Structures are given as structure tokens and as C-alpha cells.
Amino acid sequence: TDKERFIASLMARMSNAEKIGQLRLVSVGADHPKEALMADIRAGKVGAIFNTVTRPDIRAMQDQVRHSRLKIPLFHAYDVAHGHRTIFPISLGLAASWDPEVVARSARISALEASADGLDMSFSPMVDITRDARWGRVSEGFGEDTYLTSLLSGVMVRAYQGSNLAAPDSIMAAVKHFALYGAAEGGRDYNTVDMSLPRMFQDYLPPYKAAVDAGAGAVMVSLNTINGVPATANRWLLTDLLRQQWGFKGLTISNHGAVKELIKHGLAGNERDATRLAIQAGVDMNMNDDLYSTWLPKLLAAGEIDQADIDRACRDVLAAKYDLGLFADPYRRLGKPDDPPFDTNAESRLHRQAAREVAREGLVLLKNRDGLLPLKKQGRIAVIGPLAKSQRDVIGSWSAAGVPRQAVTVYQGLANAVGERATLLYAKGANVSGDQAILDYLNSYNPEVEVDPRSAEAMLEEALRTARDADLVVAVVGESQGMAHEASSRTDLRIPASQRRLLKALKATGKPLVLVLMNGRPLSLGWEQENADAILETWFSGTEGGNAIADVLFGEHNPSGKLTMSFPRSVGQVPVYYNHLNTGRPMDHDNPGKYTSRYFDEANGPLYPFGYGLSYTEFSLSPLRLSSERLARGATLEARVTLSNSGKRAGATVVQLYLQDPVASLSRPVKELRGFRKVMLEPGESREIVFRLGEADLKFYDSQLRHTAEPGEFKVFVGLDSAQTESRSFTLL
């Protein structure tokens, strides 16, 4: 190609110093002061920047390139996870939309806004499967299902990169965290991951492959061990699998200080040996620790690495810059030199309509006793709890360049909706935690949690006076965003105790109690499901969160969100997930005995299963019908069902298709998602839903990692959640 000629001609000009400079990815910080970094760019010693995110600041770096010998342009990256300046819901909330077009819209707008500020790359999407609700990074993924997360992984990559990676409104996707990062033992961040190869191939690796097959330009390597070998030093993972088996042609990027962390993992006794392990494993670009620039020349001179190791790494960096259009115009995302200056954070540069529409789709109605919701815009509404007026929490963790002061709180959304037609009464009620050690943690590094200095009792008495003066209570409760972030693993999945004390006292007033939950992970909600009159899961809903939440609470939008991760009854049940194996002694409704796979001291199964979520209307499914009883190899089967809105309000629901392979050479899950359809219906409307199934839906990795579909029975389940289904069978020939 012209591309491989261009790259080979450029690399034939480069010294090893220049090639190694391309591998260096750095941020402005205590480790890399701005002026020292600018001098290094002028010297050709920097390949890319992260965490510089405004047009003037990015232009100033790109300007320094003109002073180097070869003038190779930088690329600029950032953590655009669920929004750049207009923040969408957290990924776990986006997944609850069950709508690839909603997810695509969030990614497209994110890319538009990030590229509008001069960024070329996001460290996104995060596509790690999560089965352990304790892990603080569950908020960054799409939940527990391999099918859904694989589909959304490909959608996010395509939406970011567009039809052309050189387009000024495109960014390159660096899919993360390769691999298995969300299986951390104990749900402790960065911890050991240990799993069988069949589980790895069938359940955990497919989302990364979906990103590679969608054309992701980059892969960000994870921080964890995989079966004893840190990903950063894992040649099987980064070379044999990612390059040789999957055919990935793009850029591998280390995580932050990950090469140096090989010493703490016990793979290397010094930085020189760590550098050798990372580059030979297949890590191209070294984030922040500068080990590559410090040690690659010495390693090469000693014969401890090959010239081909440097050349591979450099070619991948240059090829990413080529695809981004940066050799054609290094300023293609930076406008013209005499464009007038502007306010990066101007209102007119936000996308509030997209954020509000997307955030409505993710909200999950978990409980609604006797039609309490939707509320009428009238009377006296008490708005109570530490998350009601929180701008910092509504934008979530990994909020990129989001500005808390631009965010709509739940309180403000309700004020906007009711204008002068209803009276809102506010009381904080409790601090986010009553445990001072937890507040100390959450205010470590940055003051992110406002602490009311009053006693817990004084806050409670104020909230009880407010509730007593109202017709009903909207309690806005749950986690602060720093409880569901990197390194914030939890041993308790309940609402914090200070807030549960508040909820118990509010319940005792007899006022109708509506819970508006914010949180970044599944929560244990047994008391709430028994006592609250209605419960709306809002995740962290973003810059327009409070307006989208008010839209649902007042019935402008009929809640349509459904869970993509199972909600355990308690932390002592972890893990719970819907695509588990039967065991020899299943406990389910049809197997209720003592000598089954169960706990004895708590009810069994999730409180809310995968695919659960209610509506202000009711839906009906006709009987499931398959197009035949037998499926030949090479053929497709259809599964048909009619969905009807049998209630009085328009709304959407999600029709889910699951497969079981009840007899196989491995024990296969009791159900596995293999299709879904989100459908919006007016009252009395029907839609015929046709699912297609072929052999590709039926295959699995056996003990020898053969990817096989075995002849025999398959069971096809359809329903509006993973627990409320019916089945029909066919036979594969």
C-alpha cells in the first residue's frame, strides 16, 4: 500500500533514538513538568500525550514538533468514557438502554466533542465482563453478559471512529482493559485473575475481539495477572492471541506505570528486565514511567532485545498517526491558526438534548406499588437525601472534561418540571456516609463530598420535619461517584448506613416514599424492595441526569431501562449472574431442597435478575413459535413472538432471547443471551418480533478449545427478563 511505503520510507530515516521516542506516551504532571515536556517534544523524544484536552493547549504541544528533525506529529488521548464535556450516563446505565442506537449516539457525540477540542484518541470503550459487584470499575462496563457487551463494544468503536479515522469529528478507540481485568479476585481492584481457558475464550475475551473486528485502532493492556502472568508481560495474550490468532494490526498501549509494576508483580527484579519483558510480549507504547526511553538502547546494545522489537512498536505508532490523518495535517482537529479564541466550556458547545434523551433510556423502574409513579406536577414534594443536590455525583466516575456546575441535579430537574405548579421542600437528611473513615477516603486527593457539619440526629430531625410537611417524599440516595471508581472496592453492597437510617425514619412517617437511587454497581436492596413505595435506578445519569429523572418521575417518559447485571440479595452471595451452570444439585423453583447449591441464611437467587425492569404499562407476549423442529448445518432458524402493549400508556420494553444447550461435552449455562429487540408500543399496539438463529449462536469452546456446535437439542427461551421466560426446543442435525 501507499501506507506501508510511506511508513517504511519514514522509518528508514529514523535513528533508534527517534524510533524509541515514538513509543513514549506522557502527561503533564509532577513527573513531567510542562516546560521539560515541551523541550522533549522539540527533541523528538515524545510520541503522544494524554490528559491535555483543550484546543489551545493541544495546539501548543503540536507547535513544538516543528522544532524536531523529522517533525513527526503527536497524537493526543484522553479518558472519554461516557462523554467529553456533555456527560452521558455511566456505561452500566447506557447498557440498560438495550439499544445499540442510543449507545452509538453517546459515543458519536463524545467523539464529536473530544475531536472538537483537538483530541485524536479515547481510552474507551471499556468492555471488561463484570460478575463481581464489589469491584469499583463495574460502573465503566456494560454488565455481566458476553453477548450484549460484545455487541456494544463493536458499536462504540464504530461510533467513535466513523467511516474515516482521518475525519476531524472521528477519534481512535483504544479498547480496554485487555484482558480479564473485571474478574479480579475478591472484587479488589488490580487483583489476581485466575480462570480456565474455556471460560476465558467463551465468556471474557469476545468483547475485546469484537472491538478488534470493528477496526479499533488501539488496545490498552490491563494491570492484572492472567493465570500468574501480568498482561503487560504476557506474550501469549498480546502476540499469539491478539496478533497471530485475531489479526490485530493496530497499536498496543501499556497502562499507567504498568511496565514498572512488573517488579511489584515479581516478574522482574529491576526496570531493565521489566522493559525487556513488556516490549518482547508485544507492548508498543509505554505510558508515563519512561522505562522504554531509559532502557531500550541498553537492552538492544546487550543483545537482550532485537531491532525488530523496536521496529514493530514504532511502526504501530506511526501507522496510528497515519490513519488519524496527522501526517496529512497535524492540525486537522485544531482548526486554523487565526480562528478566534473561544470558551471551551461554552453552553453552545454542549449537546444537552442528546444527553437528556440518552439518559431517559437507561433509567430502570425496580418497584412501583399501586401506580404511585408517575407523579402529578402538583402538591408538596419533599426532596430528601445527600444525592438530591449533588452535581459532582450525577456526572459519575470517569467524567472526563464534564463540569459539575453545568450538571442538572435531581432537585433542579424536579424544580424545572413543576415550575410554580408544585412546592418542593428540601432536606439533606444524611451525609453520604456516617463513617468518618469512609468520608476521609472519599475526600482523599480531591474534596468530592460535601460534609454537612451537623450531627446525624439533627439532619434526620430536619428531614422528618420536611417529610411531615409534604404529600410525599422523593428520597435521592445511594453511592457517591467516588464509591464506584478505580480502586474503590466495597465489602458491603447496601446503601450506606447513614442513608438507610434516613430511609427507615422517612418510612415511619407514613408518607409515600419514592427512592431515586444513584450508584455505580449493583446494590443490595432487600429492605428497600419490601418498604419503599417506588424505586427508580438512575445509575449516575450525567449532565442532564436530573432532567431525564424528572421526565420519568412525572411520566413524560415511560421507564424502559432493564438491568444488564444481576442485583445480589447481599455481598455474601457474590458472584451471582444469570448465565451460570446448573450443577448436579440445582436450587431453583423446581429444585427447592436442603441438599442443593444454595445458602441457608438468606433467600436464594438475585433480588433483581438480568434483564429486569418495570414499566408504567403492561406488556403481553404471544406463545413462542420456531420456524422448524430441526435445523440443518448452514441454515437459519426463526423464533417468532408477538409483543403487545396491554396497558394504558405508551412505552418500550426489551424482548430477550436466550439459548440453552442442555446436553454438551462441557456443562453449559442454564441460559445464554442470543438476541434482543427493544420495542416502543402505543397502548394496544402489537409487533411481530422475528429472531434469527444459526449455528454461530450454538457453538462453544470445549475442553481442548475446539469451537464446536454439537448435534442435539437446543432450548430457545423468550421473555421480558431472564427469570420470566418460556421455551421451545429444536434439534440441530
Ligand X SMILES: OC[C@H]1O[C@@H](O[C@H]2[C@H](O)[C@@H](O)[C@H](O)O[C@@H]2CO)[C@H](O)[C@@H](O)[C@H]1O
- From the list Mg ion, a second copy, ligand X, none, pick the one residue 501 interacts with, judged by a Cβ distance below 5 to 8 Å according to partner type: none
- 492 binding partner (options a second copy, ligand X, Mg ion, none; Cβ < 5 to 8 Å by kind): a second copy
Single out the segment in contact with a second copy by CB under 8 A; choices: 92-100, 261-269, 375-383, 630-638: 261-269
d(CA 255, CA 223): 7
- Does 263 bind Mg ion (CB under 5 A)? Our answer is no
Contact by Cβ (8 Å): 657, 675: yes
Residue 44 — φ and ψ, nearest 5°? 80, 20
* Biggest distance spanned by C-alpha atoms of the chain: 80
Answer yes or no whether residue 489 interacts with a second copy by CB under 8 A: yes
- DSSP string covering 422-440: SEEEEE--S-S-S-HHHHH
| Contact partner at residue 527 from ligand X, a second copy, Mg ion, none, CB < 5 to 8 Å by partner kind | none
Considering only CA atoms, which of 581, 563, 575, 539 is closest in space to residue 676? Answer: 563
**Could you say whether residue 629 binds a second copy (CB under 8 A)?**
no
The phi, psi pair for 238, rounded to 5°, reads -90, -25
Which residues ranging from 422 to 481 are in contact with a second copy (CB under 8 A)?
435, 438, 441-442, 444-445
> Least distance to Mg ion from the beta carbon of 444, Å?
35
Q: End-to-end CA distance of the chain: give it in Å, rounded.
A: 45
Q: Which does 710 bind (CB under 5 to 8 A by kind): ligand X, a second copy, Mg ion, none?
A: Mg ion
Check residue 262 for interaction with a second copy (CB under 8 A). Answer: yes
Bridge partners of 713?
731
User: Interacting stretch for a second copy, rule CB under 8 A, among 138-146, 191-199, 329-337, 369-377?
Assistant: 191-199
Chain residues binding ligand X by CB under 6 A are 50-51, 79, 123, 176, 220, 223, 255-256, 486, 595
Q: Which residue in 51, 196, 307, 628 binds a second copy (CB under 8 A)? A: 196
Residue 594 makes contact with a second copy by CB under 8 A: yes
Interface mask (CB under 5 A) for Mg ion, residues 691-710, using x and -?
-------------------x
Q: How far apart are CA 383 and CA 426, in angstroms?
A: 5
Residue 176 contact partner, candidates a second copy, ligand X, Mg ion, none, CB within 5 to 8 A by sort of partner: ligand X
- Burial class for 280, CB neighbours closer than 10 Å (0-12, 13-18, 19+): middle
As a whole number of angstroms, the distance between CA 553 and CA 447 comes to 31
Residues numbered 689 to 708 that lie near a second copy (CB under 8 A) are: 702-703
Residue nearer to Mg ion on the CB measure, 58 or 626: 626
721 annotated binding-site participant = no
* 679 annotated binding-site participant: no
Q: Which residue is nearest to Mg ion (CB)?
A: 712
Residues, the chain, total? 733
| Total of chain residues touching a second copy, rule CB under 8 A | 85
> At 477, phi and psi to the nearest 5?
-140, 165
Q: How far is CA 620 from CA 92, 95, 370, in A?
A: 27, 24, 20
What is the Cα–Cα distance from 185 to 204, expressed in whole angstroms?
Answer: 15
Region for 406 from its dihedrals, namely left if φ exceeds 0, alpha if ψ lies in -120 to 50, beta otherwise: alpha
- Which H/E stretch holds residue 174? strand 172-178
Q: Using the minimum distance from each CB to a second copy, give the nearer residue, 335 or 586.
A: 586
| Of the residues 479, 661, 672, 697, which one makes contact with Mg ion according to CB under 5 A | 661
Q: What are phi and psi of 437, to 5 degrees?
A: -65, -35
- Residue 214 CB, nearest distance to Mg ion (Å)? 30
Piece of 3-11, 243-251, 505-513, 664-672 that binds a second copy (CB under 8 A): 664-672
Question: Exactly one of 4, 101, 329, 602 binds a second copy (CB under 8 A); which one?
Answer: 602
Q: Which is nearer to ligand X, 178 or 295 (CB)?
A: 178
Name which of 277 and 563 has its Cβ closer to a second copy.
277
Taking CB within 5 to 8 Å according to partner kind, which of a second copy, ligand X, Mg ion, none is near residue 572? a second copy
Could you give the CA distance from residue 547 to residue 207 in angstroms, rounded to a whole number? 32
One residue of 664, 680, 683, 686 binding Mg ion per CB under 5 A: 664
Three-state DSSP at 615 gives coil
- Applying CB under 8 A, does 599 fall inside the site for a second copy? yes
Show binding-site residues for Mg(2+). Answer: 661, 663
